[PDB]
Amino acid sequence: EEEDAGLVAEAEAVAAGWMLDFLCLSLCRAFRDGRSEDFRRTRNSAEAIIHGLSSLTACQLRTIYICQFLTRIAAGKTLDAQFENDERITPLESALMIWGSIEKEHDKLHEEIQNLIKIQAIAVCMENGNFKEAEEVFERIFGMPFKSKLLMIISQKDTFHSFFQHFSYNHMMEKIKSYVNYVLSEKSSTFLMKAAAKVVESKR
Amino acid sequence: EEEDAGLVAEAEAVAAGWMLDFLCLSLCRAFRDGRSEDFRRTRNSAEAIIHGLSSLTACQLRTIYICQFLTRIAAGKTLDAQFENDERITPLESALMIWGSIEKEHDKLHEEIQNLIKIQAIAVCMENGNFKEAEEVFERIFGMPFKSKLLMIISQKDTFHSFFQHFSYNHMMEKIKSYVNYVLSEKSSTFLMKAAAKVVESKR
Numbered sequence A, B: 001e002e003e004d005a006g007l008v009a010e011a012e013a014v015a016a017g018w019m020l021d022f023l024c025l026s027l028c029r030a031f032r033d034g035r036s037e038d039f040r041r042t043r044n045s046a047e048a049i050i051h052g053l054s055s056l057t058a059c060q061l062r063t064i065y066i067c068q069f070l071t072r073i074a075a076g077k078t079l080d081a082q083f084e085n086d087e088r089i090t091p092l093e094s095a096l097m098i099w100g101s102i103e104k105e106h107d108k109l110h111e112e113i114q115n116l117i118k119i120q121a122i123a124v125c126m127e128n129g130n131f132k133e134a135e136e137v138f139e140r141i142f143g144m145p146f147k148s149k150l151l152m153i154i155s156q157k158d159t160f161h162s163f164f165q166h167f168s169y170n171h172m173m174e175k176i177k178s179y180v181n182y183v184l185s186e187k188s189s190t191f192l193m194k195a196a197a198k199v200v201e202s203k204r
């Protein structure tokens, strides 16, 4: 009876890990496709499964960070969303913190996404008329060429500027979608998705 | 590209069905064991997975009803919980409605659980000093021997009575746990739990 309960809890932890990988794959795909409502519902499922997990493997921590990163990027223009205990931290700043924490290769794409999030973290505040908040995000992030141009843009209180058209929110999303395609390819062989695909293919 | 998206959505629906059965099994086990916090977290995961489902098979509808039934029974003494659009319906009344809707055998255990929920739906109101609400639940449910004894008990405004000790909340829970053990045995062979158990056993 005691061994039975033990084996059952271990089996629930295995299944929870398989559910986490499948939900991360589904979340990545909804993000890449721009399926906003599927992303919302999948995100809710992923959060609930993660709340039911205890200690994590390095792989599971990376998967959770990817889910959290996409959630913040999706909420990047929702300045009312509070992702950190410190209520001042904006969604793009929270995404930047996770991006710098993930155990992943720092290739050129990594740095380009990093710099696009830094620029857009300021741009989203400016576009909302939140000029003082844009200066506070700048101080928190920056923590010379990009830096000084950004401070000049903030000080000129322009709700829109040329620099933000070149390092745009759409540019940031496309670069992130390139990384999401890699995560999708990497996770498409995980157990639950492989098993479900084999079932669907067998019915053709 | 269009066929790929189609196959992927079908595979997500297969995996969602497997997640629903596993979460129902886990929910049943937490209910049977009295693991309140695991029941809360599993219930949250089950609700989120169900929100991500569209059309249901007869089997999936029965699984959802079992999850909803246990959720209401667990909340049976939480008279502040609103499970129906009609705000007057108490959690035990909502459990009774689902119990009468499930495509299941109406064996002696079915009727005993049914009658225990009817009695306790009144008992929980009386124990809270909600005498008028107890009369309203009685009218909605009842809808001769049990019926007339219950109306007499309600009219005597006793926060506690002998009849409710014989057809007690604990008696109701034990009878329901007997049915949950059957559901557990029936669902223990579902795909995700079988696969996870095979992994755990292979590591011994």
Ligand SMILES: COc1cc(CN)cc(OC)c1OC
Binding pocket: A050, A051, A052, A053, A054, A055, A056, A064
């Ligand atoms: C130990 O650390 C975490 C554990 C869980 C599991 N519920 C979730 C977490 O974040 C949602 C964690 O922080 C990374």
Ligand SMILES: COc1cc(CN)cc(OC)c1OC
Binding pocket: B050, B051, B052, B053, B054, B055, B056, B064
């Ligand atoms: C068609 O009917 C239902 C469908 C779903 C799927 N989200 C959930 C349901 O209840 C939670 C339903 O009612 C039984």
Ligand SMILES: [Ca+2]
Binding pocket: A079, A080, A081
């Ligand atoms: Ca804000």
Ligand SMILES: [Ca+2]
Binding pocket: B079, B080, B081
């Ligand atoms: Ca109430």
